[PDB]
Amino acid sequence: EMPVDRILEAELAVEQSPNDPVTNICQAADKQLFTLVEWAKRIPHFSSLPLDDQVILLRAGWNELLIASFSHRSIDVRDGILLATGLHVHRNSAHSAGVGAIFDRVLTELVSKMRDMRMDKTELGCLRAIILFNPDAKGLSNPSEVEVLREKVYASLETYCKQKYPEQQGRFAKLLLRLPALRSIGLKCLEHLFFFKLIGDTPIDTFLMEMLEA
Amino acid sequence: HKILHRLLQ
Amino acid sequence: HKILHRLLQD
Amino acid sequence: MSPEQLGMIEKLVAAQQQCNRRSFEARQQRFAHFTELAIVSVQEIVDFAKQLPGFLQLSREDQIALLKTSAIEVMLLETSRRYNPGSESITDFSYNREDFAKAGLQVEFINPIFEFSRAMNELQLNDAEFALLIAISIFSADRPNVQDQLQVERLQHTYVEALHAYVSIHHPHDRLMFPRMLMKLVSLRTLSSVHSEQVFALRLQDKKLPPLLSEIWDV
Numbered sequence: 001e002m003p004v005d006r007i008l009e010a011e012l013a014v015e016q017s018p019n020d021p022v023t024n025i026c027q028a029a030d031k032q033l034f035t036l037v038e039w040a041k042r043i044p045h046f047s048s049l050p051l052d053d054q055v056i057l058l059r060a061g062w063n064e065l066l067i068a069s070f071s072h073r074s075i076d077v078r079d080g081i082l083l084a085t086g087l088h089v090h091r092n093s094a095h096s097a098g099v100g101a102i103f104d105r106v107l108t109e110l111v112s113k114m115r116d117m118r119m120d121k122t123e124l125g126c127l128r129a130i131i132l133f134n135p136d137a138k139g140l141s142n143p144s145e146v147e148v149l150r151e152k153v154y155a156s157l158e159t160y161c162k163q164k165y166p167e168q169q170g171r172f173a174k175l176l177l178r179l180p181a182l183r184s185i186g187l188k189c190l191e192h193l194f195f196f197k198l199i200g201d202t203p204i205d206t207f208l209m210e211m212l213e214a
Numbered sequence: 215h216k217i218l219h220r221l222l223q
Numbered sequence: 224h225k226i227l228h229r230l231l232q233d
Numbered sequence: 234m235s236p237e238q239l240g241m242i243e244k245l246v247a248a249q250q251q252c253n254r255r256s257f258e259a260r261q262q263r264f265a266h267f268t269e270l271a272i273v274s275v276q277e278i279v280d281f282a283k284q285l286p287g288f289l290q291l292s293r294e295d296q297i298a299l300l301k302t303s304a305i306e307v308m309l310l311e312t313s314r315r316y317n318p319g320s321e322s323i324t325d326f327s328y329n330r331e332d333f334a335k336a337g338l339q340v341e342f343i344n345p346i347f348e349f350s351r352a353m354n355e356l357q358l359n360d361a362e363f364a365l366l367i368a369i370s371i372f373s374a375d376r377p378n379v380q381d382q383l384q385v386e387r388l389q390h391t392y393v394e395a396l397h398a399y400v401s402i403h404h405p406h407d408r409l410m411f412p413r414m415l416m417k418l419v420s421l422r423t424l425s426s427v428h429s430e431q432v433f434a435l436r437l438q439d440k441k442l443p444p445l446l447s448e449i450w451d452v
């Protein structure tokens with residue numbers, strides 16, 4: 001039904017002049033937007049909800065999905081994060097660009113804790129499936145279908161944490177206590193992309209642009 | 215919309 | 224900082 | 234699970250279940266009603282926190298920091314109990330949408346608040362799962378400005394594992410009630426945000442009123 005290996009597979013398949021940090025970030029978000037859809041498509045079952053649902057969930061869930069993915073990929077960067085493009089952003093620039101406070105928030109609540117615990121790649125893939133399967137999304141034909149699928153991940157993942165890590169008692173809850181901060185953090189990051197789009201002075205690209213015009 | 219759709223197809 | 228500190232130390 | 238866990242839950246239910254009662258268009262005043270009310274909660278919430286094993290311990294700017302931004306989450310959680318599915322309403326007198334909409338709130342902040350209350354009502358949680366869940370909600374490491382982040386994520390964990398145990402014992406055939414519940418905290422981050430945007434909306438009205446409210450909602 002929701003097997004954890006078919007999730008990590010996806011986690012894996014998607015596996016990879018001047019630098020302004022916001023120009024670099026936006027380019028990076030766009031790049032990834034494309035491969036988001038390709039990661040989505042390999043989530044057991046995602047393929048199969050109605051179009052209009054598949055499109056509400058990628059719209060509602062994309063920013064929190066890119067973030068988790070980059071914090072996770074940023075584990076051995078220091079005071080920083082590693083763009084899909086290879087370029088980096090570090091606190092100094094984050095702070096310059098006015099994004100100081102959630103940038104550190106991203107560092108402290110995600111990159112770091114994703115270090116301290118050594119969250120492995122299945123665990124990430126599953127955290128991202130749980131994220132993608134978002135039953136509060138305004139517009140869904142069948143919110144309980146979405147939620148049943150979600151709950152398929154919860155049981156797959158708990159089960160899995162009892163396999164790979166039987167000595168860590170609550171690791172499954174440690175895993176999910178990341179998603180509430182992921183959510184506040186992701187709401188704030190968006191208000192910044194919104195304000196960067198409106199000033200116009202930051203170069204947005206085709207795909208991310210569509211994501212940002214409701 | 216437009217772009218997402220056709221990738222989802 | 225304030226009416227809270229009063230609800231708290233109390 | 235452990236009798237220790239079990240006595241801690243019992244002390245919590247009691248803790249809640251007693252806090253839970255010290256008891257209380259020119260018609261703007263409808264609004265200033267809602268105002269009177271939210272104070273009563275804010276009161277109860279600090280009242281509850283203080284009683285939590287560990288809370289007076291922390292630097293009181295921490296226990297400020299935690300109280301300050303847990304408040305709606307907790308107040309939303311209780312609004313979620315105290316909700317009547319046939320009435321589509323919330324309680325001897327009660328509260329419609331048009332009521333919410335009758336004070337100045339008149340946007341959809343309202344629809345979120347009510348959509349959440351029908352979801353949490355359906356869970357059909359009890360006095361233990363609710364308090365348990367409020368206590369997790371209060372010990373959120375990640376609130377704005379907070380010295381002892383490890384202390385908080387740490388007293389969190391006590392409640393988290395107590396609930397995981399409690400659920401395992403009592404929802405033998407529905408063990409996803411745990412990540413199901415736990416996850417409302419996430420939805421609780423969105424509601425709270427929608428509440429600031431609500432607070433923001435009428436502060437260009439102006440209204441602010443209550444010292445206490447502007448104190449938590451940093452106006």
Ligand SMILES: O=S(=O)(c1ccccc1)N(CC(F)(F)F)c1ccc(C(O)(C(F)(F)F)C(F)(F)F)cc1
Pocket residue numbers: 267268270271274305308309310311312338346428431432446
């Ligand atoms: O006052 S509530 O009705 C309430 C009743 C009982 C216990 C706690 C709270 N309430 C509903 C909520 F879902 F949020 F819990 C509520 C809370 C906060 C507000 C407001 O902060 C204020 F001003 F009304 F107090 C505001 F409407 F401004 F946003 C309004 C209603």
Ligand SMILES: COC(C)(C)CCC[C@H](C)C/C=C/C(C)=C/C(=O)O
Pocket residue numbers: 022025026028029030032062063064066067069070082083084085094099102103188189190192193
């Ligand atoms: C400082 O944070 C901003 C708001 C500039 C970035 C917000 C995060 C969104 C998801 C933009 C994406 C950055 C990406 C997608 C990096 C990556 O994976 O390459």
